[PDB]
Amino acid sequence: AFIILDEVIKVTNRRVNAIEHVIIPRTENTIAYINSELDELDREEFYRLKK
Amino acid sequence: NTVSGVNGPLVILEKVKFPRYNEIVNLTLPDGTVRQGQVLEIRGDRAIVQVFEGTSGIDVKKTTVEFTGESLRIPVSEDMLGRIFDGSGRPIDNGPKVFAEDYLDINGSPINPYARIYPEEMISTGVSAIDTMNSIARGQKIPIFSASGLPHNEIAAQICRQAGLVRPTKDVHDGHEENFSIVFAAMGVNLETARFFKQDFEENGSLERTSLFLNLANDPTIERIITPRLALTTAEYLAYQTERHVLTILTDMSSYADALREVSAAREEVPGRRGYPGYMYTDLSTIYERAGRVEGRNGSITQIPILTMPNDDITHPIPDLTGYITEGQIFVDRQLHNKGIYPPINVLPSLSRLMKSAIGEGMTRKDHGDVSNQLYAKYAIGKDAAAMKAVVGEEALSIEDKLSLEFLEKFEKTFITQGAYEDRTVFESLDQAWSLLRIYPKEMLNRISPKILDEFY
């Protein structure tokens, strides 16, 4: 039981580190990139209308 | 009368209030060439015209106009096949003009004798991934969604070469009995590829059966948009008067969309979301209108529009609006292309919502609609299992999922893959579907009624 416990904890430890460092910041950066383009399409339109 | 001004490529005429709407006017320029333009709008003591040849040369006081008195209409013959035209139907080979037996309107709004009988008989394009999954019916218009990073021009080409070689397969199926003719319209496409299209018609031996309208990007914007309307009108004449099965292949919608966009930069009409006109929908719908079973119900026009996504996403204005007007969509994808697949067709967002009703057992089989339904569910799981496989490890896998991972690859590399010259029987397609499904027990199936399954599996 010990030897197995020793192997499984090593895998569970890698997964926490992976989701924390890689996954979450990728979701932040991608969201942001798209946000910045997106708001500008709505704004420029209003300026076009006004002109 | 005379030019007051020119604003962008749009030319502002000052003129007296008499012209027809969409009336051709001829602008006399001092350079030995007279050109035609069409009043885009008629207004109070002025009209704004975009001139169909060139974009420069208009002068203030050195210009003369004379009103033709006749709005543009396409002069139509059913002898127009076996001729090479440009975007105005003028010859480029000197000699073969459109000519006429009748004169019909470019919008096709006067005649519109489209049958109130829903797509009926089967059509194939000889590509298994198309035929089985999103099955084409005559009069059905289902778009080809592509993305650039692709040999998307090669996929269009493949379909053009394949169209008319399918037709003896279809005669035998009894989803065709009558002549097959091709109407081919080119907008903003490369030089090399224009020679590929001519060459594909030549091989087939359907050069006589086809009309080519060739329009480049160095030919004007307004003139680009007219081109498919000429083509379309001629197809409607083919379908109605002589009860033919007409396939018009209309490439490239994206080029057509830009052209619309460049205008309205001096019109009073204002542009909506993402700088696209709000009546862009209206423009697409005029093109799309000639498509459907004709009255006589022995002819039809089937329409295949070719769209390359210029940005790659499907929520971009060009694809988003089109998908709505049409009944389903067909997705080509970059990812398959990368592995080294041809024709690379992803089927997961691909669905045609009028597929089941059109088709029946007499030219397909009853299991055609069931066997397709099974293959989507299994492919979908295989795709999610793959994504999870990367992140967590093989910890989130389960027995069904491991089987699904293999299924994905099996399907991708045997089913979807085939040569350019290759064409496929629908009945054949269906035995290859069953084969892939043979690696799963039957208790795990549920998108097929147990009666149906027992017969063909």
Place this chain on the structure above:
Amino acid sequence: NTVSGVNGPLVILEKVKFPRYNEIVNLTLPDGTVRQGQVLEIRGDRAIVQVFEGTSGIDVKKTTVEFTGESLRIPVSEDMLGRIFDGSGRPIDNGPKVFAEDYLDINGSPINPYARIYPEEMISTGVSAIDTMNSIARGQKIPIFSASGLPHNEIAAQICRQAGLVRPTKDVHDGHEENFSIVFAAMGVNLETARFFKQDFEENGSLERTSLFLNLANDPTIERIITPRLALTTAEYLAYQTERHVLTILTDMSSYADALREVSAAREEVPGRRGYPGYMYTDLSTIYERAGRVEGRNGSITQIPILTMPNDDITHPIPDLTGYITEGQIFVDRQLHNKGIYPPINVLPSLSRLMKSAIGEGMTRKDHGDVSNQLYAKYAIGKDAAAMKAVVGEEALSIEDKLSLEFLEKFEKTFITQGAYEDRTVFESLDQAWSLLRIYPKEMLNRISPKILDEFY
């Protein structure tokens, strides 16, 4: 005539059509104040002007004009060394009266006798972090890209105090042959920041060899845009007449861009993407052209502009335009600062286009460039491997990888860490690099030829 209206910093003047473009006019206010302005637009019996002084408080018929009849030019002199100015060329600390020996108009193009022979000599500040990875040639422009929460001011200060001590050492090597002068233009910065820069020039004994132009943010937005340009006109004069290498430090670029943006959303032009100007590029381009060797070929203008991202991204319209025009960038990072590394300049994506050109063999080794290629590769892979170490542990970390982990630490704490009075030289930097690089086997070190490798491990 007199003032019809003012809409923001635009002033609507009614006056006749006789003035020239950028002709100075003077506004007589009834408040006992005169304000100067320059014609941005001339129209049919009216002009639209941006005033350098004030931004508001402009009347109708109380306010009158007299036109100067003279276009906007800078009295550029060479005995301008050691004198202190503001953002218009008035003294604020009682530096010597401007005089005149030549007048040059500001247009980003005085006489423009910029480069058609590229730079090839080397300038070192004694900073390894900068010099090795980014080889600064005698008329290249490499900006400093930093972000908020960093001491960008402090690094700009390192350059200014350490320059003018390293340069005579470099004079003997034939890296230099002539004196150095610094022309510092500050834009839109705090009192506290402005004093810091002045403190650095006093402290060294280069207050007599520097020109300082101070613009604060509470001085008009129109004054702020003229400030970098004024500095640059002067800079070209010193280069021309007395043949010195002039280094220009133009800080801060974001402040300048905020000024342009207010004069583009208050203009009758619609601005580009993210509400940032459509000719924002152009405005930036004006500075940047004014780079390279100046006639007599022994003076030059070299540029380091200082940018702080106000939104922490290279996504933003300022970094992306800036980086295209210049030839490299020197990148500073947040992580390194937090840890206790000064200067905190990271070397991960810092890049020099004209690296090859800048290195020589009559004042630098030829191995500067070869060894650079190794450091950039090794550091880059090493940073990425470390993040990877965190995730995986030691179950996908090799022996070789352990060695990359050691190279990374050592590079950070030695190569990048040096105090703000520590002076290096190129030969020392190479020697220290060689040592770090030494633990790697021969096989590993593969982007550098065997001839070089074998001699120096």
Place this chain on the structure above:
Amino acid sequence: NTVSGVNGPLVILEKVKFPRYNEIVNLTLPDGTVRQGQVLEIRGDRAIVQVFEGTSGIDVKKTTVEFTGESLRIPVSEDMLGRIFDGSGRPIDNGPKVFAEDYLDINGSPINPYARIYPEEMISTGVSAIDTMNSIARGQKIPIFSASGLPHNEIAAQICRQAGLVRPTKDVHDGHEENFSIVFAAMGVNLETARFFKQDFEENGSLERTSLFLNLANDPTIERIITPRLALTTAEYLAYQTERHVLTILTDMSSYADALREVSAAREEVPGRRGYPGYMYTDLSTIYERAGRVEGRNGSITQIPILTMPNDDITHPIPDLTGYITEGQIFVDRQLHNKGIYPPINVLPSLSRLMKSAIGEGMTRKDHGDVSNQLYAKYAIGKDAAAMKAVVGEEALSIEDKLSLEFLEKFEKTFITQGAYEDRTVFESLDQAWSLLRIYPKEMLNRISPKILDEFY
């Protein structure tokens, strides 16, 4: 007397400049239908009018206009209550005249006497989740942020209908010596919903405690924003002159916001992000200014606005601006409604920032504050425990997690869940709380003073 045009909701009437701003005008039609409207803008020989009923169908010559001479104000009275009104405050009850005692402005402020004295003294809603855990004291404005995935109207009614049955119970403990009145404002409402509120009130016998104003959604947008403004003014008069504690229920702020975004279609006023005004702040503020302690301070006007997220986005502009202004917020989530808990207020991110400031005694107990800390912290931990249980299993879980789990199920199914016609007074709520918390020993209860903990476990 001559309608110039109609451009959407906005109507241009051409008649002289002698009217004042927001003066009611009458459009007299040959249909015998008199419609009143209010001038939005007045300009030289034209005014721009939004008609309350309809907005179009007026002739350009067969019409006349008359000016009332009175700007819009509400006839306010204490005998007005217990009656159903439209969005202009005109009976639909088929009851008598509105009656006046004063005419008070509905423009945004009547006299604005909003105190510089902070909230104390409990106002009871009769919902356990709100009252104990998020104590609202008079003058505070705490919104309910709900979604369309919840039954927002039904929860809103619940707060009104159970409110004011709390009051005899308060009078005995001596919280309230003066009476309690409800002002209920319904916006852009569906017909079933308008009727629903009256029926609920009738059932409890809360009908004559409240006045209901219904504006229906077929009624134009301008009427709709006027509705809460009418309500809020009536309330400020009852609260000031006859000293009563008033709870004002305003649903739906999202429909009010839409109206504001909606008007602008000939104005030279541009909106901000997502199409919603840059001045969306300003409009919110307007409702918000009537809310707080009245002068004399035993009466108050207490405001609970109800905001519906249409797409579950907390980064949606409507909630964000509001959230900054408001003294906390109540979050209601879809998840709990799904388990079948009703009301389904998750008290997980809900907060009252002046929680301590409200309670006392005589309408609360001393032990109220300590308990609020025990239950929130234990609950949060309960959610975390549910996820862990799924993973570890039931036969491998911790003691501390097991307790936290037990608490989650009881907490949800007893404290939050209450019946439609079951009133939950604050004294009643606090007892149910001790039963839930009892399961933890004294050793695990510690955000409670040992004095309390010894009284009640």
Place this chain on the structure above:
Amino acid sequence: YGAIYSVSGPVVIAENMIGCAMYELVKVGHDNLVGEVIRIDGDKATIQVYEETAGLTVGDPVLRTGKPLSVELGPGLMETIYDGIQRPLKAIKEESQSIYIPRGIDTPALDRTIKWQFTPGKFQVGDHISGGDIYGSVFENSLISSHKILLPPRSRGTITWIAPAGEYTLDEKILEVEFDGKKSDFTLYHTWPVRVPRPVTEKLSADYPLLTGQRVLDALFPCVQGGTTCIPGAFGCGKTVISQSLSKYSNSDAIIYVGCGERGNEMAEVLMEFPELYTEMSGTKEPIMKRTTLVANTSNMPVAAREASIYTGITLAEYFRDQGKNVSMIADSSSRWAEALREISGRLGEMPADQGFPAYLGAKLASFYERAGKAVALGSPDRTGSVSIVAAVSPAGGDFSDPVTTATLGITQVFWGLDKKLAQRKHFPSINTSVSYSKYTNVLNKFYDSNYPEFPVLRDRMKEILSNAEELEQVVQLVGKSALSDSDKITLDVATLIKEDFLQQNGYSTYDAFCPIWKTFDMMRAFISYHDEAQKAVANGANWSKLADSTGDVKHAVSSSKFFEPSRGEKEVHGEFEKLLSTMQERFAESTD
């Protein structure tokens, strides 16, 4: 009268339009095109012209008719297909020889040759009369002779003339009303403005459930006659199949099918399919057709028609409502109407401010909605009529964040989900309890309690099984399965059963033509009983595996339920499901010990 100022797109501008209003019917040009003055700018009127331009010149006359643009509702509406401007499509096929409307061709709003049998009302001479009171009735079909001829909304007076029973035309006058002097003579047809909500005696709260005929739609949140509903689409997920399928399966006295701006193939399908198939009301000789009045617009026809579509359609539901007929109006898809509105917004040149979409859009969507509902029929004899609006919503850009959907959810009280991932997997229509709500629920389950069922109890448990499954699935994906509680496994398993039997059904259930409430209740009742017995069974001790193996025979039997049709027990209560409960109880006995 007026002289054309400019023609820009199919929009015509005309100067010299005075004593004109803003909804006027006009004849445009020398071509005499049907048209309407939408707005006016000073003297210059901006007119939307409902036939295309291809040759209309400037300076041609514009003649105002002296009245608004209205639609005609008379007899013969049933068993005929019209367009959205409402000119008979069928009559167009013979005479013009063009199946769809030709340019420059005009045809009046209804057929003027058709003769109808008039039978007298409940009025005689010299009687006081009012609006929506029944002046007669016309035997309109064979299924229904329920077509009441009414005095129009907004009419009162005394009837000077009552004509006797007989055969007449619908142009041939039969009624004179005198109010103050001659009000007008009346005929079988009556006119109604498509821009006003039709008058009503009172609106009443909805409380009578309609059964959709789809077990899944009734099960989670019941439909009501008088209500409002959204069904999500995506334009390739078989949204059409379920729309047309609902229409057949739902049972009302009159049904109005409104194709807003459609494929043209899809419209064609319904036109063909309905006389071929049968009603569940025993309809004969073109069964379904006799019950439907059909509004057909394709997107390829003019944008004006497509604006007009919804409005004509709602007025038709409303006309029948006043007669005391209960109506199902299925309008598909409301997002295409919004796309027509975005088109108008840019063609006139009005400001868009609803995310690149119209100013008016949010309010126009609400205005359409408020015309639907349950009511006491117009006129004093008192009848019940109702209109349930089923309005399809689908993307106009984003997935639910498009303007259309955001507005519609605000105003709708019933929402039934449709997930895309399950659509591609074939498990449509998929109703997700998070993406679904009904505010009508509480009055509806109390209604079903009166009818016989225990229904409210089953609802809570149905919700609980679906609800926990979504949360446990998120732990399954990330962590994996190596453990998942005995109780948690059970919930997952049973939720699969609910998907397969209910949620999946559309040409996969051999009985689906109309499904009673009792049968739905009986089916769900077996699922819930299996659930409670199972969770108790693991807790009182018995392995999860032994419990799967012994339940065995019954578990399959509930899996197979969906194919089964009423053929045992009553006509709505089914014995195979009743038998099932008792056998279940026996399985639990084997399984615990």
